[PDB]
Structures are given as C-alpha cells and as structure tokens.
Design a protein around this ligand. Sequence first.
Ligand SMILES: NC(=O)C1=CN([C@@H]2O[C@H](COP(=O)(O)OP(=O)(O)OC[C@H]3O[C@@H](n4cnc5c(N)ncnc54)[C@H](OP(=O)(O)O)[C@@H]3O)[C@@H](O)[C@H]2O)C=CC1
Length: 273
Amino acid sequence: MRTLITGASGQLGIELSRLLSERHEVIKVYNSSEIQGGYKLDLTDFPRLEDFIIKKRPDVIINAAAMTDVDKCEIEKEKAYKINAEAVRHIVRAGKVIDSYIVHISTDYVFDGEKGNYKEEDIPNPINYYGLSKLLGETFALQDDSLIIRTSGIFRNKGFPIYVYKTLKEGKTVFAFKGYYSPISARKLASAILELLELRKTGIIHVAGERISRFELALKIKEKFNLPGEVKEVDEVRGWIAKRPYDSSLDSSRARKILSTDFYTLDLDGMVV
Ligand SMILES: NC(=O)C1=CN([C@@H]2O[C@H](COP(=O)(O)OP(=O)(O)OC[C@H]3O[C@@H](n4cnc5c(N)ncnc54)[C@H](OP(=O)(O)O)[C@@H]3O)[C@@H](O)[C@H]2O)C=CC1
C-alpha cells in the first residue's frame, strides 16, 4: 500500500519489485505469470481493476502492464487497445478516488522514427499499432499530477540482446534491423524509477539508454561472449508484421540532470541468462 506495481511479473516489474521492496510496501499484480506474494488481476476486467485499487489504497501506482509483442498488437488491435490504452483510463479514474500518485510507463514506438533523439515535447506519430495503443494510453494518463515515463528497448530475460545471445550461441544467424534505438536494462530503468518516485516528478520524462543500432548491439554481444553464428543487418526483418520506426532513440538529457544514477550506459550484465 506504499506502491502498486501493475505488470509486476514482467521484465521491468520484476526489477521494480526487487528494488522497491527495500523501503517500501509493495503490491505486486500479475495476470498469466504467477509471482511470489503477488495478486492475480486482469487489468481488462475494469470493475475488478477499479475495486482492487480502491481497496488496496496504494500511495503510488506504477503502471508497467502492457501487451508488448509488437506483431501481435498489429493483428489483435482490439486486445492491444484494451490493455495498452483503455485500462489506463480506469487506473487513472480509480487512482483519483484515493488521490494516488500515478506513474505510467510508455514507449519510444510512439514516434515515427524519421528523426531520432526524441525529447519529451516532440510530437508522437506512431507507425505501428503497439505504438498507437500505447500513445492512446499516454493520452488517458495525461494528468496535472501524473508522470509518464517513456523508455526504449527494455531488456532482461527477453528483448533484442537476449534474442541475439540465444540465437548466436546456437550458431544461428541474427537478422538485425537497420535502425537505432536506446535500449535500457530492466534493472537500470527500475533504479531510475525508484529515484523518480521519491521526487514526485510530474509531466513526461524520457528514461532510456544510449542511441545504438541493432547491428552494432548484436555484434557487441557476439564479441563480448565470442559467440559463433552470424549477424546480418537487414532493411526489413522477414517475418515482421508491423513496421518498426527507423530511429526511435530517445533524448534522456532531462533525466540525466535530475537523476544521480547512470541509467543509460549500456548494461549487458542486465541480461538474464
Ligand atoms: N519491452 C520493451 O522493449 C519496451 C517496453 N515498454 C513499456 O515498458 C513497460 C514494461 O515492459 P516489459 O517489462 O518489457 O513488458 P513484459 O512483456 O515483460 O511485461 C508485460 C506485463 O504486463 C502484464 N500484463 C499484460 N496484460 C495484462 C492484463 N491483461 N492484466 C494484467 N497484467 C497484464 C504481464 O503480466 P503476466 O505476464 O503476468 O500476464 C506482464 O507483467 C510496458 O509498459 C511496455 O509497454 C517501453 C519501451 C520498450
């Protein structure tokens, strides 16, 4: 009842739970993936969601829950909307009743990727439905006293660095999208969010890694671990349904001033196996 973490069972949520539990009374919500001491709750059951919030009385809600499979979002748009956008409306509504501090997690895929180095005030223009559903959630989350944290390429037990490590280790070819983003480990992102909490920051804030291409990232991890298997850069990845933004890197300069911790230097040790 200090802090509700939705998406507690996901990459960011696991790490948030670990760190917040130090200081810090934590309510951990999962749906499909059971976690120790968690509460099972489907955020698309809106009355059950609102009741849960009003009953548990979190001082703080961190909304990390989402449908993050980009290609699945492109086909199952109704499902993506309900969790990535509409649930946020209900989190905000119930939160307001208890005057909770709402921290909502968003994505670099809200941008069209034609510019890169996006700052907080740059205008979203998503080119895939994951990005659009998330942008609609941002829109519901926009409140005088809420905080939207946009991030990029969260990695822990999944995300691109893991796909690279597992694929190359088995001698297979990695097809690396020609384009940039700003990958941050779940643990570094969690550490930043903890700092932000104490501060009761409001508005929008970018918290992500250094700008890097998928190709360089893949080859760094190949070099790091002398992995076999080839890295091939491709203009378009075969099998992809959704279009990815060319350069969705974020400009996190504001957060770099605010926060003490280096959340941005590439953290490959944040990979989980
Ligand atoms: N992953 C990435 O590359 C990036 C992610 N983001 C954003 O960061 C946040 C965290 O992402 P990440 O940790 O990687 O995502 P994960 O895919 O690892 O976790 C998704 C979480 O959402 C929960 N969830 C999904 N649907 C529901 C639902 N219907 N009801 C309750 N919980 C649900 C899942 O719970 P369960 O498994 O228990 O069902 C899981 O805890 C998200 O907001 C994401 O959009 C932003 C930029 C990059």
